[PDB]
Design a protein around this nucleic acid. Structure first.
Ligand SMILES: [Mg+2]
Ligand SMILES: [Mg+2]
Ligand SMILES: [Mg+2]
Ligand SMILES: [Zn+2]
Lengths: 141, 94, 38, 148
RNA sequence: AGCCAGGAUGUUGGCUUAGAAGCAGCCAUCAUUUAAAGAAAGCGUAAUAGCUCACUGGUCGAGUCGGCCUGCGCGGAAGA
């Protein structure tokens, strides 16, 4: 990749690649093939895990078929199934409501090693500070 | 550190005071100690810029009135009722 | 164009010009901001 | 910008890299994207991390203010846009190599690579380098010399 | 001041919304990578997208920026 051309990312799902009300048609309809994300995706699905958030880019020009790419999960979301609470407030952030796991934030961030600029993997942590002071939820460090 | 050149007042009274102020000067007075008071006339824009710093009212400061250095402290200021200018100052002898 | 007595810049692209005896406002982005009698 | 108290640090720091360095390259980033820096930072990355720089400064007035120190071969580089690269550890290395390979992927010009300092001279891409540790090319020079 | 460049990654921050993805609102406004780049000063969008700014690198080559106080003027100003 030394040249971007077309990319729309709308976090899909693994266990069955065959939506319809969420995405379905709207994921493939301008030279894209609905028949091949269940031939090709699931070929890169089961090696890892299934069910949870999947942003994604594909290689469709106007060339009929294509080839599918993978990505990475959102980072403040690894503070849901990778922290506690699943909203983020409840008392609008006029109140500092949330609550953290200091141990986590490094290895749970580190899981997103393949998409960050910090050389120091510790730096990749310091990013997650603000990503996790996104409400004003203090970490019991 | 504040060095204020000044001159003894040759004229006093409402008449002169006003005149002074027309010419960017302005009267003030040094009193204190056991010696007599002294009628001063100061250059306006100067004291203005000086008194812009808060230290002016805290620090001891020096007035060079006909070559002496009297060395005093700002007791009281008279500002214009609605302009940004100074009318008069009381200096206490330190 | 608006005429008004007080004219003043509106957009960051509004410009103000004194043509003839009259003070004006020209906006390169937004026609609504033209002004005269300034 | 900042006053002198800051134009001095960009010096005392950047010139103690020259005073305490290894190799120097060259490059003019007219069109220097950010996928640009991103990459070359992973390269600095492989090439340790933050052992490398590129601090755009070609204000003669800056990264020449570090030259009448060492590398006065650069009164001549410093004109126009430049991206100065210093090495601390590492071989007089590969740093050299990918700048040509990078910019030869379009990746903008390379100042024709006006070149620099290890010797005290100019241009020409060399891999006379990171063979370094290719002392094995003097290990194979053993048994093959002993046998043949 | 022009002109060339860049103007990025966590990430659509969080919340709230049918949708708030820098930019309707609320709270936060850190951290990376850096030469510099606001969790964004404006255009834009259904929302994204898209165009700029701040900021920094280059070019250029000596002055330049904007407040305070004051003098004289300009618009505002149509009638039998
Ligand atoms: Mg009278
Ligand atoms: Mg006309
Ligand atoms: Mg009239
Ligand atoms: Zn406008």
């Amino acid at each position: 990749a030394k040249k971007v051309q077309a990319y729309v990312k709308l976090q899909v799902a693994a266990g069955m690649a065959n939506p319809s009300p969420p995405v379905g048609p709207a994921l493939g309809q301008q030279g894209v093939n609905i028949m091949e994300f269940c031939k090709a995706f699931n070929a890169k699905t089961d090696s890892i895990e299934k069910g949870l958030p999947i942003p994604v880019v594909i290689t469709v020009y106007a060339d009929r078929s294509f080839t599918f790419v993978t990505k990475t999960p959102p980072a403040a979301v690894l503070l849901k199934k990778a922290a506690g609470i699943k909203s983020g407030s409840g008392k609008p952030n006029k109140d500092k409501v949330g609550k953290i796991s200091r141990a986590q934030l490094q290895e749970i961030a580190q899981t997103k090693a393949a998409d960050m600029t910090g050389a120091d993997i510790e730096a990749m942590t310091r990013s997650i500070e603000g990503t996790a002071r996104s409400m004003g939820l203090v970490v019991e460090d | 550190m504040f060095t204020i050149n000044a001159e003894v007042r040759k004229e006093q009274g409402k008449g002169a005071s006003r005149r002074l102020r027309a010419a960017n000067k302005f009267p003030a007075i040094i009193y204190g100690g056991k010696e007599a008071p002294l009628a001063i006339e100061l250059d306006h824009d100067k004291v203005m810029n000086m008194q812009a710093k808060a230290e002016f009212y805290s620090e001891v400061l020096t007035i060079v009135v006909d070559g002496k250095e009297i060395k005093v402290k700002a007791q009281d200021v008279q500002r214009h009722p609605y302009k940004p200018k100074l009318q008069h100052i009381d200096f206490v002898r330190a | 164009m608006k005429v008004r007595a007080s004219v003043k810049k509106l957009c960051r692209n509004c410009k103000i010009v004194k043509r003839d005896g009259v003070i004006r406002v020209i906006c390169s982005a937004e026609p609504k901001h033209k002004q005269r009698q300034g | 910008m900042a006053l002198n108290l800051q134009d001095k640090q960009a010096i005392v720091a950047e010139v103690s890299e020259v005073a305490k360095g290894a190799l120097s390259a060259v490059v003019a980033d007219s069109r220097g994207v950010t996928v640009d820096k991103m990459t070359e930072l992973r390269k600095a990355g492989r090439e340790a991390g933050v052992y490398m720089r590129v601090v755009r400064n070609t204000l003669l007035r800056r990264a020449v203010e570090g030259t009448p120190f060492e590398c006065l071969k650069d009164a001549f580089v410093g004109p126009t846009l430049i991206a100065y690269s210093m090495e601390h550890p590492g071989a007089a290395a590969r740093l050299f190599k990918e700048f040509a390979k990078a910019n030869a992927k379009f990746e903008v010009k390379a100042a024709a690579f006006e070149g620099e300092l290890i010797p005290a001279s100019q241009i020409d891409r060399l891999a006379t380098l990171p063979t370094y540790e290719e002392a094995i090319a003097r290990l194979m020079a053993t048994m093959k010399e002993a046998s043949a």
